[PDB]
Amino acid sequence: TNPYARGPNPTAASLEASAGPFTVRSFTVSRPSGYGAGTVYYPTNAGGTVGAIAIVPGYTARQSSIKWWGPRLASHGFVVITIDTNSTLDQPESRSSQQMAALRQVASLNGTSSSPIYGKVDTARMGVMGWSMGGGGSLISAANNPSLKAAAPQAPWHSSTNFSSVTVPTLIFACENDSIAPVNSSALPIYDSMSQNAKQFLEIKGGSHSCANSGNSNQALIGKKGVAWMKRFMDNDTRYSTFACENPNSTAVSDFRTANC
């Protein structure tokens, strides 16, 4: 039996719902270590230790843009830290460093007896997500730290599209009508560069650059896919293999690709 499996067997309905099975609480990081600010979301009633995920916004943006992932993922059995960067104008390499610093501080808090997440984290199982430059930072993080278990950036933005070094299972959310980081010059070339890993491409039909942000109108589908990918790869949880790897065959998806899943 898989020691990392948490929660009831998934259904499409349970993964499309606003909340998973676990109760979620959150706190503000008192003294952020290597990044600007953070909120930690965590399950209060998981049956074991859970992996941790660090999420980074885009240029000019703050936690609000990516906050919805905090409760959505934590309610399925993850500790999620959403960050503000040291500067809203930080570039992808700095964003990646700050994302990894946030994961490090989650590990610090797991070993800090006063913290609400004391002993709640399996520090060997971690994932990275983020929007635009924060998505590029997620891909840099994965390239530089292949022990990361999963990556799921959204509408990624990076000066290079060559991520052939990435061996981490990577799901790329993309937005069809993105005019900031057009799919044809950013998200798709990034996807196509990745040759060694489980990978997936999910493009939201008609989506603007903010199509996977807080307040999007596709939270059932996007949330199902993000949770399923993290469950399958961070928890080795093959109960999620079909949800993670399937084409959802959805009229809301204008481009779907997957390989080695």
Side-chain angles (χ1 to χ4, degrees), residues 2-261:
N2 180 1
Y4 308 140
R6 310 273 175 267
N9 295 342
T11 61
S14 77
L15 299 187
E16 289 158 6
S18 292
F22 302 122
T23 299
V24 173
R25 295 299 177 252
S26 67
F27 62 90
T28 299
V29 173
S30 167
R31 198 209 64 86
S33 161
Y35 58 98
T39 305
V40 175
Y41 298 83
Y42 63 98
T44 67
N45 61 334
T49 56
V50 297
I53 301 167
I55 314 189
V56 184
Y59 199 73
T60 82
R62 289 177 170 85
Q63 292 180 60
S64 177
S65 63
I66 45 94
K67 170 171 56 127
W68 79 286
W69 281 119
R72 180 54 164 275
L73 284 155
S75 73
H76 286 273
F78 295 100
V79 171
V80 183
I81 184 164
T82 59
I83 70 170
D84 291 309
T85 48
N86 286 327
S87 169
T88 68
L89 310 184
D90 290 331
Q91 296 289 321
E93 286 280 349
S94 176
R95 288 178 191 268
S96 171
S97 292
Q98 292 181 65
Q99 178 173 53
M100 300 309 300
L103 287 174
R104 179 171 49 218
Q105 189 158 34
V106 168
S108 164
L109 298 175
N110 182 62
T112 299
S113 74
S114 60
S115 177
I117 60 165
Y118 186 51
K120 285 192 171 64
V121 183
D122 183 340
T123 62
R125 304 191 289 110
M126 291 176 162
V128 288
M129 300 176 62
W131 177 39
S132 203
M133 281 187 191
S138 291
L139 293 153
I140 295 169
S141 287
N144 286 333
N145 303 278
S147 298
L148 287 168
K149 301 283 295 290
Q154 63 200 54
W157 186 116
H158 193 277
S159 42
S160 169
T161 61
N162 187 349
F163 285 91
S164 66
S165 66
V166 172
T167 57
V168 174
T170 296
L171 161 64
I172 294 174
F173 293 109
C175 301
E176 181 178 40
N177 294 341
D178 198 325
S179 214
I180 302 299
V183 172
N184 278 343
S185 59
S186 294
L188 185 58
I190 290 169
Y191 176 82
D192 280 338
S193 78
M194 288 187 298
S195 58
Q196 298 185 73
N197 57 343
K199 62 175 185 175
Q200 189 160 114
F201 188 75
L202 197 155
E203 186 189 78
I204 297 296
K205 181 172 298 291
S208 81
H209 183 57
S210 56
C211 84
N213 291 7
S214 303
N216 77 76
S217 286
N218 289 287
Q219 294 177 46
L221 168 64
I222 296 173
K224 166 170 67 180
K225 271 288 185 180
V227 168
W229 195 262
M230 294 291 156
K231 278 282 201 184
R232 171 57 182 86
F233 294 111
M234 297 190 49
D235 296 359
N236 308 332
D237 192 342
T238 59
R239 295 181 294 171
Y240 290 82
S241 287
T242 297
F243 289 120
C245 298
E246 71 187 350
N247 187 336
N249 298 329
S250 163
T251 60
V253 174
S254 45
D255 197 331
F256 176 84
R257 311 178 193 217
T258 200
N260 303 330
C261 198

